[PDB]
Design a protein around this ligand. Structure first.
Ligand code: BOG
Ligand code: BOG
Ligand code: BOG
Lengths: 340, 14, 340, 340, 13, 13
């Protein structure tokens, strides 16, 4: 919600409060999403300033407060900063921003990250170029300097972050993306490579000195219809945990497929169908394993731009004898959302 | 982590 | 403070900064409130949207940042999220909201939670239906479909929360409240029962498979006078800690009594007097014990709606030889408040 | 950014998002600032209410969210509340504020705390009166009751805070400051003394039952030029860390010198040069050592009041064979800042 | 924990 | 911790 606009500086202070509950059989330890309260809240600001007729500066911050924690010693469990960056923009030359932001490979994956609650299982946080990461310098160009309508591209540099965990660490890397949109149709491709930390290499699962992720997307968005398909392949980038021997690391190779179909009714109701399968290969000790595999049936009723309610059913196809211990039970999300 | 891909785009909105 | 109001959606961004100091003799380890700096700050937003002539959506979020912590490794000690919910409303049919919100028994206990700093000792946080709790679905109706002026009722469903602590856990439960108000007079009754988690049962203090809480209140609020009285009984719900054996759990039975008297001067000064006594029964190894016991003498000066200053003296009646080690010293709070 | 102003109560909600990177040779463990991502964001509010013709109330809160942390277990690393206080003001009689606020000695040190990223190395946080501290009651008077233009003074009482760490703890103390400004020239002096906790004395480094800090500053600020000089001395107050024996504490005595020169061009670019050397004496086991020592070459380009970019190079003079293991490598900060 | 009980009543006001 | 010394002031708001 725009709360300030004076002397060419506008500030959008936005937030939302999501009352959310997960339903799964038993305690949910063997389920896809879990069971219990999942209420959360978001706060952040989006700023944009007109430096002159052509130059434009902007900055953004976004935070996630959890509501399913007590006021005691576990109050901060799950709280985090989602985004925090700043950048500049020149007319048709492009826009350059640095900070914690999304990786370029997300440019493709977003096509299928439209579900009411779940979806986009490949857009892992702090996972190279597929999700929100820290310290990424990103240059983006729209319409190729104003020469082609619908043609956009981006190039990104990922700085090294040697953290205490191999999951949340990364080395230096570069990536890019290309996208074309014409009359509601869209085609996208994105690729990224980066080094791996010593801590990451020392882990039992995964092999190699470089990690690489790439994905491609095709969508149709028009006439109240939304269709999207994503295919991506990753090497030494997807995090995995073997629960039987309690070992962690990365999959040497994964094949990821995402499908989404959605319709938008005039009065608000939005039916949703989706398919998602991520399959790993060359996993040390197992070979091939299924990481994600399900169909989705969900509906979202938009009362208006500020309030919504959704129901999301995940029909889990994972085998009960998964060789990595992946959950095999279904999960039902029920949410009521206020947002501004 | 669903619904975030709704309006992601290359470039800076204005 | 209302910062946005367009298209039938208003957003109130509210906060406060409370510079606060507690005074007790010695280190304050044997006191009611403690000793030292207690400054803190609050932030939150309350959103309300007019979906149509009758339907109304709303959401709320509130956070507590502490100011008495250093910028070092203890910076987050005491920070927490107080509220986080969203709901809908139909003309007189009622309102349904889910998330972290107040328990129904607070409807009664709130009558006596009017002191400047202390008071309302029975509305424990994360304690079933008497205080702020997580994941409560609440249906509330006013005026019984618009037929009786002053008659309101509420029914609430409390979801399971198995947390890392026995104090902050709870099972499934249900509760309700009814209230009638006529010509400044108000009567309220509220009751709640719920299951107990295995972790809660495994604790040395307390016995049973269900926890029970109920309270009743009577108030007069008019002519600058506010009188309120609360009586309530709890079963396996009040948290207790034996400091001599360093054990925790819940009181098998408690009798709680709250009394409050207040006057409001035209120019701002509001004197306040209160009494509070909570006594436990069936305590393993001790029998009957005093949990809370004090008189209160305090004054609050409202400079205006945004600024206030108060002094609160708690004359503690707890016995110095209390068999649970409950503090017996007095405590005086001095506060200066800005709020918006 | 002022977001509310009705009935004489205005609320300024201000923030900034700083994309920041530090550059140092190697891993940066032996450097002044470090190496890697340093992005961060700030949020806060400043409130002011007109109680009557003379009385004025105010309050403030500020928080620092880090952007260089992952969404995993270290999400809260470095987050903290910088300020949190409330106070009142009477026309020419003075202003009193309590809470977590700046120590009085910062009044002097602020003269030389003008660099884009670094600087003000003596204004340690939670270190008696030289930086942001908790529970400080501060009375300040401007223009000596309106009789002398440019003459200001302040007196501050710091309450004891027995924290879990010796670094972030402090006892009771008193301090003050005096300042005079005429035609862009400014002279300032400030002094403060305080007790030390038992835990503080038990540390191997430092000896005594009193902590003492005083500083003096001289500046000229006009005609696009800003020159400033600071000299200060501390006794049993400056934190010190011996990395070779893994011991920490305080220097029995320190002599601090700060110098700043800056110019402001009409089109925005602001060159900056500075010098800073703090040297401790009477350190048990080492004697005399240099804690801080460097020259600075830096520039800040102000696109406007809301957007800026800066580059800060620290030429470190610390010896590579420093007897306490203090960093000796250079550091270059590069930042892009949006703010409102 | 004082002053929080004011208002509330029942229902979303 | 740079840029914080600007403003501040020894007295008044
Ligand atoms: C409205 C807030 C008033 C601010 C109180 C400033 C006085 C600080 O209070 C101090 O507390 C210390 C123990 O905690 C003791 O040294 C003394 O009781 C007192 O000097
Ligand atoms: C959009 C939010 C809908 C609110 C859901 C209200 C139903 C509460 O859900 C309850 O939670 C318990 C686990 O905590 C389960 O054991 C119960 O089966 C379930 O009924
Ligand atoms: C104003 C912010 C500029 C963004 C800096 C983008 C360059 C990223 O910086 C990178 O950091 C790595 C370790 O941190 C180094 O190993 C690389 O040499 C360096 O290119």
């Amino acid at each position: 919600a725009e709360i300030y606009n004076k002397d060419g500086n506008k500030v959008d202070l936005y937030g939302k409060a999501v009352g959310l509950h997960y339903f799964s059989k038993g305690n949910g330890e063997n389920s896809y999403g879990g069971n219990g309260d999942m209420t959360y809240a978001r706060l952040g600001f989006k700023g944009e300033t007109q430096i002159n007729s052509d130059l434009t500066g902007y900055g953004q911050w976004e935070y996630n407060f959890q509501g399913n924690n007590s006021e005691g010693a576990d109050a901060q469990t799950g709280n985090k900063t989602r985004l925090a960056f700043a950048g500049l923009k020149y007319a048709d030359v492009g826009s350059f921003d640095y900070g914690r932001n999304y990786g370029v490979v997300y440019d493709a994956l977003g096509y299928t990250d439209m579900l009411p609650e779940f979806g986009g299982d490949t857009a892992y946080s702090d996972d190279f170029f597929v999700g929100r990461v820290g310290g990424v310098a990103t240059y983006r160009n729209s319409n190729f300097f104003g020469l082609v309508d619908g043609l956009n591209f981006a190039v990104q540099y990922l700085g090294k972050n040697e953290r205490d965990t191999a999951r949340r660490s990364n080395g230096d890397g570069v990536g890019g993306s290309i996208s074309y949109e014409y009359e509601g149709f869209g085609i996208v491709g994105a690729y990224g490579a980066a080094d791996r930390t010593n801590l990451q290499e020392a882990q039992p699962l995964g092999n190699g000195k470089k990690a690489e992720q790439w994905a491609t997307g095709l969508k149709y968005d028009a006439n109240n219809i939304y269709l999207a398909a994503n295919y991506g392949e990753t090497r030494n980038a997807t995090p995995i945990t073997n629960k039987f021997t309690n070992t962690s690391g990365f999959a040497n190779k994964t094949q990821d497929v995402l499908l989404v179909a959605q319709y938008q009714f005039d009065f608000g109701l939005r039916p949703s169908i989706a398919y998602t399968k991520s399959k790993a290969k060359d996993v040390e000790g197992i070979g091939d394993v299924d990481l994600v595999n399900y169909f989705e049936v969900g509906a979202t009723y938009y009362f208006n731009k500020n309030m919504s309610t959704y129901v999301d059913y995940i029909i889990n196809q994972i085998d009960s004898d998964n060789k990595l211990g992946v959950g095999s039970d279904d999960t039902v999300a029920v949410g009521i959302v206020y947002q501004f | 982590s669903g619904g975030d891909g709704r309006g992601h785009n290359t470039g800076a909105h204005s």
